[PDB]
């Protein structure tokens, strides 16, 4: 996950593949707040 | 002249490390001096309280004073 | 000075506000013995000890950075008390290799 | 934390959030009774409110070189701060709904913004380094909305749209 | 337990008071700066007033600059750590340009002059219509749950007020 | 698969989003008869030849018959902007 | 007071690079002590002795 | 068992040649010595210490002993049940004699 | 006792539970406080975690020689380990509901899985020491689910069902 993040920097084919990885990340951060509410 | 100034400048690099190791050693040494005096001072303070007088005796002078006074505060 | 030296005794131990009495009185005694130093002032000489030390511990990059930080430091405000500050950080300098043995097993002695 | 992090996010200096002019707004290092681990992500949360007041300064200089398209580019970009600021209002009621809110939802709401905000800063930075004026901005912003990242080409399409209207002021009176 | 992030406001407040103290020792002044209670809902009413150009108990109006002055200390500043101490100054400054317009309109009436332009009077008849427009919008600022729902509301009127205030400042009169 | 649709969706997210700027250059290559592709990288190997006495030259490796429909269409559409139409 | 905030951010960089191991609150105490005047030898000597002492007390 | 103090009592007892309580005074002394603040001289390199020992052998003309020790160092490391080798090597260094 | 063994059963090694990877397992009991009688049975439960980590290695290796029915049987077999693992966390709360339970409880729950675990591990090892691949893994497990033991013959019809389902896909498009 740290490696996958290291690819995120700020052609388009290669940018839209990086953004498909990151669009997929907000659904893993969506889970992060689920499991964060059980433990708090 | 050239080699003399090369040897000179390296010897100084090494002597700086050595000076500072010795300097630190006096700081550590001063700590050891004072910490031992502090233990001892503490042993003595306690011992002179015990052997120089009877704690026993002073606490019985107060007791007889408390009893005698109270008896007299009913006369 | 008393409120400041004391607060140091509480913080370092992270606990105790009169349970640090022993350490306070001790700090006061130590400070009450008159040390004399090897070199008093000169910004360049203390800065140099810190540079050589950097090289010696293999933190060469950081040593490079420290020089930028030193110059920066003067510009955020000029210090009259720098030699002493820069020394204190010097004496607390450590090497990135090795541990100092155990000091959490040393208490039991 | 909860109202206090909205107002570090606006970019304005706090005591806990020190401003050092070398770095912009950043959280001060290793603050006791907070593990150091949560401040690293917090430094990144400051990086979107640092570039946002590196942004109002690009506005206020030309509002309230010279160019009638400079202040037209100010009204291109303000609608990009419009969903931004709307998410600042979306966090506020969340904190009334519950005021025991942890910072991991706050981190999540802002990851949408993290690839939108340095990409507009780099845009204004190439503008201010070539010292551009007038109509030859619209071709620099056009090959920039030719850009990848789907939020960001739309962002760079709103900035394109407003100063193309000032081209239209000229070309409506000329024709 | 909770860490600061989860722990609400109080934990953060205790922290802010401790941290500021740490800095406060090297700086020596008559009396150290301390907090003077206001609540967060009491701050949003002192700011409701400063938009019309009226003082509360955090604002001291200064005639020497014809501007308002907030408390500079560690004066309570919401639960923010001396952030409202800088943020509230930009919106008190937004309320300061509203007292310039009303200061200029009452002095450019010609029932106090008859040597200054008729045209000069005619600028005010339109100018006074933006002033009442402000007064219904200051009447519409509640609800305020934070100082942002209001500063962002006047983001749009702010760009304008700075132009529209300082065109007057030179001093153009008449046909000029 | 067919134990769960969740990893089928995961690879298709990466598929439909990587492919999308790569379709919309080809779409422009027809309806506008020209494409945006640098002179320092050629990224799909369709490129317009500068000469007026020649159409379009395909670069070689330095589904495939469906790619041949793109070569012949793009040839004819690169023409049609060069012609005056009726 | 504005001044007081800037100096500490640069100072904290040196101390953490050089390995010193003092939190924010304590780093402020030493700067006070050095401004009111202290022998530098004493200050280093105490800090080292308190640290050695603290770790044993805890354990 | 293996606490610092117990381990020290075992040292005194056997070396002086007497019982546990007959070595009681030197036991008190010993503790005072250990509890003296000493700052590490080794905070770097297992290698540099190994080199000094090798220097000791050469210095006394005990070259054969240095040739064997070098091989023996390599073994000592390899079994590696010691996690404070360096300290031991320093102790042995100070006990170097002819 | 109990929580180190609950998680060495999931296949996470101890050092009082030595596992040296795929050549063998040593039980590693030289434990004073656990009795020589309660540790002797603890070795009997350990053999059933040895065969549990010889089975998950075959999962991760062939989902991540050649054949779509090796990895289709890998998504059949995880579904059968799904009540195994389900039972592993219900036991977690069993030791929190009262702390008056010991490893006698662990012997009682794990005999239901004891009639599943060598008998399926020998099936896949017989697949893999002949190197069987393709449609004839399904014939291999079919002639095993023609076999006996009433839990296993129902279980292997389920493991047959997900990758027969993958068969069903080829001949639906082929027709």
TrEMBL record, chain A:
Transmembrane segments: none annotated. The gene is LOC108708438. This is Gamma-tubulin complex component. Component of the gamma-tubulin ring complex (gTuRC) consisting of TUBGCP2, TUBGCP3, TUBGCP4, TUBGCP5 and TUBGCP6 and gamma-tubulin TUBG1 or TUBG2. TUBGCP2, TUBGCP3, TUBGCP4, TUBGCP5 and TUBGCP6 assemble in a 5:5:2:1:1 stoichiometry; each is associated with a gamma-tubulin, thereby arranging 14 gamma-tubulins in a helical manner. Gamma-tubulin at the first position is blocked by TUBGCP3 at the last position, allowing 13 protafilaments to grow into a microtubule. Belongs to the TUBGCP family. It comes from the Eukaryota. Component of the gamma-tubulin ring complex (gTuRC) which mediates microtubule nucleation. The gTuRC regulates the minus-end nucleation of alpha-beta tubulin heterodimers that grow into microtubule protafilaments, a critical step in centrosome duplication and spindle formation. It is found in: Cytoplasm, Cytoskeleton, Microtubule organizing center, Centrosome.
Automatic annotation (TrEMBL), chain B:
It is found in: Cytoplasm, Cytoskeleton, Microtubule organizing center, Centrosome. Interacts with FAM29A. Interacts with HSPA1A and HSPA1B. Interacts with gamma-tubulin in a HSPA1A/B-dependent manner. It comes from the Eukaryota. This is Protein NEDD1.
UniProtKB/TrEMBL annotation, chains D, I:
It is found in: Cytoplasm, Cytoskeleton, Microtubule organizing center, Centrosome. Component of the gamma-tubulin ring complex (gTuRC) consisting of TUBGCP2, TUBGCP3, TUBGCP4, TUBGCP5 and TUBGCP6 and gamma-tubulin TUBG1 or TUBG2. TUBGCP2, TUBGCP3, TUBGCP4, TUBGCP5 and TUBGCP6 assemble in a 5:5:2:1:1 stoichiometry; each is associated with a gamma-tubulin, thereby arranging 14 gamma-tubulins in a helical manner. Gamma-tubulin at the first position is blocked by TUBGCP3 at the last position, allowing 13 protafilaments to grow into a microtubule. Component of the gamma-tubulin ring complex (gTuRC) which mediates microtubule nucleation. The gTuRC regulates the minus-end nucleation of alpha-beta tubulin heterodimers that grow into microtubule protafilaments, a critical step in centrosome duplication and spindle formation. Belongs to the TUBGCP family. This is Gamma-tubulin complex component. It comes from Xenopus laevis. The lineage of its organism: Eukaryota, Metazoa, Chordata, Craniata, Vertebrata.
From TrEMBL, chain E:
It is found in: Cytoplasm, Cytoskeleton, Microtubule organizing center, Centrosome. It comes from the Eukaryota. Belongs to the TUBGCP family. Component of the gamma-tubulin ring complex (gTuRC) consisting of TUBGCP2, TUBGCP3, TUBGCP4, TUBGCP5 and TUBGCP6 and gamma-tubulin TUBG1 or TUBG2. TUBGCP2, TUBGCP3, TUBGCP4, TUBGCP5 and TUBGCP6 assemble in a 5:5:2:1:1 stoichiometry; each is associated with a gamma-tubulin, thereby arranging 14 gamma-tubulins in a helical manner. Gamma-tubulin at the first position is blocked by TUBGCP3 at the last position, allowing 13 protafilaments to grow into a microtubule. Component of the gamma-tubulin ring complex (gTuRC) which mediates microtubule nucleation. The gTuRC regulates the minus-end nucleation of alpha-beta tubulin heterodimers that grow into microtubule protafilaments, a critical step in centrosome duplication and spindle formation. This is Gamma-tubulin complex component 6. It comes from Xenopus laevis (African clawed frog). The chain holds residues 311 to 500 of 1698 of the full protein.
